[PDB]
Amino acid sequence: TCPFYKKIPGTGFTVDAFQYGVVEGCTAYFLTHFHSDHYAGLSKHFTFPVYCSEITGNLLKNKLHVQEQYIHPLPLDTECIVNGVKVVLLDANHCPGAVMILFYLPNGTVILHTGDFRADPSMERSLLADQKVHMLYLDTTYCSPEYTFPSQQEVIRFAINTAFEAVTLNPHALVVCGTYSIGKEKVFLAIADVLGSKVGMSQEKYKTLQCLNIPEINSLITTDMCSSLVHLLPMMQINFKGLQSHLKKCGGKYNQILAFRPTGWTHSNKFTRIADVIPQTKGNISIYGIPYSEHSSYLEMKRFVQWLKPQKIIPTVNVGTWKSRSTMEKYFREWKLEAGY
């Protein structure tokens, strides 16, 4: 059954709760973003109302084949009414179309559900600043002080300079970027822009990108692999074997690969700066690991919550074991004692 952390009190709403069949009482199912864990269970066979951003609606329509009658897209930053209740969707700074949802309950309680998010100080000057939030449903993916990472802009700058150097040294080098869902598009779009190239990719991936309301998209991406010097492949192919195999397929148009694996955190965040990063190399193939995160670091999450000063926190990630919940509660109490709420 649907856990209490996916239910919004004193409404019949749920959030990211599609894997439990019919939820008893639920009149509206909200979807924060188009990542498989959150949408798990949605298909062309679903027959209840789904509320979401315009981008998430495009993806539901085109990728999952959910029938149009059940998709209720809402604009961002706009007060809307859903089944008698005031809501606002806000940019989550996660992947394309990802939202936080603000729910203004009839009794006067205000609830923020973050979805998946990367907390940022620009969120301190949104509609959130206008009133007290009593309850926060929080993306606790990286809720532990070991999780640090550079800014997105630091990582992109590094990727750009690296790629530009490599292809100026060898104009027959190919650049490959690994990918598995939506998100982290800036990695490949920024590398292509410095090289004066479009991004080549499979038909299914191109179809996905064509849903995302990216300006001038047709000038940036193609299904003609031949004509482009940045290619997208599945993350699983980003290794020496998969990459040599791909190089054989391109028909001697390239003689070297430089590949990037955008990852979350891995243990080498605890010593290395982005400027110290060096690739793994075998022959004419080099693979760079780059920690491009679309989740809050510990410090970013701590700052947002200490600013917001919620009266109660409901974790939505790592809630499956008592040890994780206990550990998280410890950090929430520390933050509250430091900040005086």
Interface with Ni ion (CB under 5 A): 35, 116
With the C-alpha atoms ordered 209, 96, 143, 330, is the resulting torsion angle positive or negative? negative
The CB-of-202 to Ni ion minimum distance in angstroms stands at 22
**Residue 102 in contact with residue 76, Cβ under 8 Å?**
no
Question: CA–CA separation, 31 vs 74, rounded Å?
Answer: 11
CB of 185 to Ni ion, least distance (A): 14
Element holding 308 (H helix, E strand): helix 298-308
For Ni ion, give the closer residue by CB, 38 or 231.
Answer: 38
CB-nearer residue toward Ni ion: 116 or 185: 116
C-alpha separations of 302 from 148, 271, 333 in Å: 12, 22, 11
Parallel, antiparallel, or unpaired: how do β-strands 285-291 and 256-263 relate? parallel
60 DSSP 8-state letter: I
DSSP H or E stretch at residue 327: helix 322-339
Q: Which residue has the tokens 């290395």?
A: 272
Q: How far is the CB of 37 from Ni ion (least distance, A)?
A: 7
- Among 298, 29, 7, 8, residue whose Cα is nearest residue 139: 298
Q: Closer to Ni ion by CB, 88 or 317: give it.
A: 317
What minimum distance in Å lies between the beta carbon of 219 and Ni ion? 28
The smaller minimum CB distance to Ni ion, of residues 116 and 300, is found at 116
Please identify, using beta-carbon distances, which residue of 186 and 309 lies nearer to Ni ion. 186
CB of 110 to Ni ion, least distance (A): 24
User: What three-state secondary structure class fits 189?
Assistant: helix
- Reduced to 3 states (helix: H, G, I; strand: E, B; else coil), residue 206 is helix
Taking the least distance from each CB to Ni ion, the nearer of 184 and 303 is: 184
Q: In whole angstroms, how close is the CB of 57 to Ni ion at the nearest point?
A: 17
For residues 7 and 38, which CB has a smaller minimum distance to Ni ion in the complex?
Answer: 38
CB of 99 to Ni ion, least distance (A): 11
What is the DSSP code string of 112-175? EE--S----GGGGGSGGGGS---EEEE--TT-STT-----HHHHHHHHHHHHHHHHHH-TTEEE
Query: Shortest Cβ distance from residue 140 to Ni ion (Å)?
Result: 13
Smaller CB separation from Ni ion, 200 or 315: 315
Collapse the DSSP code of 52 into the 3-class scheme (helix H, G, I; strand E, B; otherwise coil) and give the result: strand
Q: In whole angstroms, what is the distance from residue 8 CA to residue 275 CA?
A: 44
